[PDB]
């Protein structure tokens, strides 16, 4: 029931730079542990009791702090250091974790490549229509995808999925899927996805007319 608040939520840095990660406890604790986690892997202990390095952890990792305020510092970042980091207290039961800081790779701004896909005739036969808007290989992660159907803004009937940051070009890719019944789909003409992103001087709109 001790709440651990980590900051920042996301930290964007290049290899060779120095990362500073913060963990604030809601009430005082005697020490803080730190764990690293990469996608698809178990957490791994890095620092225990505030400043001690677990076996095999390289010296560029160091921890400090006292009371309610703790810090993990990672100097001269290596590509293998980009990951999610969690602090954990074990001074009061139940043991609790912070919500995590994502340390991601900063790179130059990369505009998305945007595509729209109408539903297939095969799917339509089954009674549903999925419309997909694809944003390929963009940086930074922040991106707005807005669906319009005959100029009506769509809300609540789309789902987004995003890849992990690419290990080779450090970009993200995103899919947004708008799902309609066939009945609703055949009642409208213009299907449009509008994408807002830092790499786009103005938003990019991809659209199609049903049955054209």
């Amino acid at each position: 029931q001790i709440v651990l608040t980590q900051s920042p939520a996301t930290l964007s840095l290049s290899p060779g730079e120095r990362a500073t990660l913060s963990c604030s406890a809601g009430s005082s604790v005697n020490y803080m542990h730190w764990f690293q986690q990469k996608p698809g892997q178990a957490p791994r202990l890095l620092i225990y009791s505030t400043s001690n390095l677990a076996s095999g952890v390289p010296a560029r990792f160091s921890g400090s702090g006292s009371g309610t305020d703790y810090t993990l510092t990672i100097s001269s970042l290596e590509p293998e250091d980009f990951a999610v980091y969690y602090c954990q207290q074990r001074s009061s039961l139940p043991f609790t974790f912070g919500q995590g800081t994502k340390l991601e790779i900063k790179r130059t701004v990369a505009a998305p490549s945007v595509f729209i896909f109408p539903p297939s005739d095969e799917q339509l036969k089954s009674g549903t229509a999925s419309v997909v808007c694809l944003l390929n290989n963009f940086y930074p992660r922040e991106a707005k995808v807005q669906w319009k159907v005959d100029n009506a803004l769509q809300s609540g009937n789309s789902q987004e999925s995003v890849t992990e940051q690419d290990s080779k070009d450090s970009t993200y890719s995103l899919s947004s899927t708008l799902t309609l019944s066939k009945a609703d789909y055949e009642k409208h003409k213009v299907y449009a996805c509008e994408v807002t992103h830092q790499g786009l001087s103005s938003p990019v709109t991809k659209s199609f007319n049903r049955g054209e």
């Binding site: 957490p43 225990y48 001690n52 490549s113 799917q123």
Partner: protein
């Protein structure tokens, strides 16, 4: 070599129980407590409790309200975590970990199991439908186009997707599955190709959903 090896993925209905094993080897089993942590998809870490492997003492996170029971078998060097009266929000990867004592003469050596996925759902096993994400017929002498396949309405995870039997890999993005309101999963896999050869190059997405023994190869090409 120290190893913590967990049992395989589980799929359960709400109200059932699950019992996950954590098999330890390569060190003195009774010298370390074992603890458990879970992680719901896309979420953070939650501590569940810990067990003393020597005398069976335990402590749990009281948020689980007596639904978690940890046990141990010294004859087999195995710790078990049972979670009862399952609910859909218990869907998570469950990890066992070897505990550590911070006052030791040497650096802590940290060890974790590989994790066990537990899916809690009333849904039944179902193979996916595979639909084309067709590229625009619009072509240019040196431009590119995206195409893909939509792998829709399957349960449980996972599905695998490759392109051209694994020959096409660069620029493929296979997105994380989303759980739909229906309780079924959906995902897309896409690839970027030259627009000039869309009529003569074949692009096939190879979909495999082992839980339903469903294998589908889908050709994707411009419409009309």
């Amino acid at each position: 070599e120290v190893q913590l090896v967990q049992s395989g993925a589980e799929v359960k209905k709400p109200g059932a129980s699950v019992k996950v094993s954590c098999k330890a080897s390569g060190y003195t089993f009774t010298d370390y407590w074992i603890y458990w942590v879970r992680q719901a998809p896309g979420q953070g870490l939650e501590w569940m409790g810990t067990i003393d492997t020597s005398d069976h003492k335990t402590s749990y996170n009281q948020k689980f309200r007596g639904r978690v029971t940890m046990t141990r078998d010294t004859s087999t060097s195995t710790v078990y975590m049972e979670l009862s009266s399952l609910r859909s929000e218990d869907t998570a990867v469950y990890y066992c970990a070897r505990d550590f004592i911070i006052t030791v003469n040497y650096p802590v050596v940290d060890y974790w199991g590989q994790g066990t996925l537990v899916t809690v759902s009333s849904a039944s096993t179902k193979g996916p439908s595979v639909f084309p994400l067709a590229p625009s017929s619009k072509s240019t002498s040196g431009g590119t186009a995206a195409l893909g396949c939509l792998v829709k309405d399957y349960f449980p995870e996972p599905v695998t997707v490759s392109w051209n039997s694994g020959a096409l890999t660069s620029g493929v993005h296979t997105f994380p599955a989303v759980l739909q309101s229906s309780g079924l999963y959906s995902l897309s896999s896409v690839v970027t190709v030259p627009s000039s050869s869309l009529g003569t190059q074949t692009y096939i997405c190879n979909v495999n959903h082992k839980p339903s023994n469903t294998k589908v190869d889908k050709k994707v090409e411009p419409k009309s």
